[PDB]
Amino acid sequence: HMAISHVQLFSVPVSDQEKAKDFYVETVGFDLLADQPGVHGRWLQVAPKGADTSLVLVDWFPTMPPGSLRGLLLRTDDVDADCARLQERGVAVDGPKNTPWGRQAMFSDPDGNVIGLNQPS
Amino acid sequence: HMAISHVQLFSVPVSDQEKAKDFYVETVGFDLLADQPGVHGRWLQVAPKGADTSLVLVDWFPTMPPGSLRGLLLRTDDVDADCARLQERGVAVDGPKNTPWGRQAMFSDPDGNVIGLNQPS
Ligand SMILES: COC(=O)/C=C(\C)[C@@]12O[C@]13c1cc(O)c4c(c1N[C@H]2C#C/C=C\C#C[C@H]3O)C(=O)c1ccccc1C4=O
Numbered sequence: 001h002m003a004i005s006h007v008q009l010f011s012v013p014v015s016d017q018e019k020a021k022d023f024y025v026e027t028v029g030f031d032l033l034a035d036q037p038g039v040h041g042r043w044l045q046v047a048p049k050g051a052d053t054s055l056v057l058v059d060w061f062p063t064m065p066p067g068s069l070r071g072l073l074l075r076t077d078d079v080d081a082d083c084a085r086l087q088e089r090g091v092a093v094d095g096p097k098n099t100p101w102g103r104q105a106m107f108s109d110p111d112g113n114v115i116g117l118n119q120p121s
Numbered sequence: 122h123m124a125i126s127h128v129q130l131f132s133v134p135v136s137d138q139e140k141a142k143d144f145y146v147e148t149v150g151f152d153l154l155a156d157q158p159g160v161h162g163r164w165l166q167v168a169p170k171g172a173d174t175s176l177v178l179v180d181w182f183p184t185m186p187p188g189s190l191r192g193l194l195l196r197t198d199d200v201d202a203d204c205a206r207l208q209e210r211g212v213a214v215d216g217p218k219n220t221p222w223g224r225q226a227m228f229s230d231p232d233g234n235v236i237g238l239n240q241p242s
């Protein structure tokens with residue numbers, strides 16, 4: 001068996017990092033983990049409070065254009081209240097809808113990356 | 122404040138899903154969580170054993186061409202041993218090498234998605 005424990009982090013392609021920081025931290029409610037120099041420029045890292053896996057808001061992978069990400073799903077304990085909060089903050093939300101795999105909604109970040117919310121049935 | 126607890130899963134763009142399944146499960150040693158019909162085709166879902174955030178090996182999303190993913194970092198308790206295992210199993214590994222954020226290595230999946238390994242200091 002391998003010694004891998006979990007995904008430490010993955011990357012979300014953004015164009016404007018200040019606008020992405022403000023979206024993920026203020027609108028979506030993530031903690032800011034880091035905002036500091038990195039190897040290809042500004043390293044901006046965010047995550048839900050307490051979570052093992054974080055997100056890096058980067059602009060330096062040509063194969064990942066800003067806004068190209070899909071199929072990112074966030075677990076929430078209250079999808080209905082989260083959707084209402086997003087809507088109050090000016091975000092267009094699709095759903096929530098009951099699905100076979102939980103009650104789910106979708107929304108986009110400022111670049112067009114698509115983010116899902118899922119609350120178990 | 123938002124009720125989001127963690128990232129449930131994110132998507133990794135692959136072409137041949139059977140090939141991807143065997144690479145992630147047999148070669149990299151991930152647990153197979155699910156392999157069933159999904160909304161837009163075969164749903165194939167893997168994770169390091171016991172991890173909160175999983176990976177979905179999809180060919181659903183035109184904006185994510187197969188093999189385009191970068192900036193994914195897996196946490197491991199023994200990067201040296203994992204690299205030796207990957208090499209034994211017929212995978213090219215770059216590193217491991219010391220960095221400011223831990224001892225890291227990189228390799229690619231059958232489509233060219235780039236996967237990092239990190240053992241913090
Ligand atoms: C070029 O080969 C790669 O694909 C390398 C990687 C995917 C990483 O080496 C890279 C990282 C660059 C950083 O600036 C990092 C880190 C890197 N690690 C790998 C990664 C990543 C996600 C985007 C990136 C990158 C690379 O420049 C990093 O792990 C950190 C961890 C904790 C705090 C800060 C950092 C960083 O600032």
Ligand SMILES: COC(=O)/C=C(\C)[C@@]12O[C@]13c1cc(O)c4c(c1N[C@H]2C#C/C=C\C#C[C@H]3O)C(=O)c1ccccc1C4=O
Nearest residue numbers: 070071072073101104106114115116155158159160164177
């Ligand atoms: C930003 O992406 C989203 O908004 C994704 C969704 C709202 C998902 O509903 C989607 C899913 C489609 C499935 O086929 C799923 C599932 C979906 N849940 C969300 C997701 C995702 C990643 C790619 C996608 C998609 C959607 O069609 C799903 O959670 C499963 C859980 C356990 C076993 C099987 C499945 C599935 O087969």
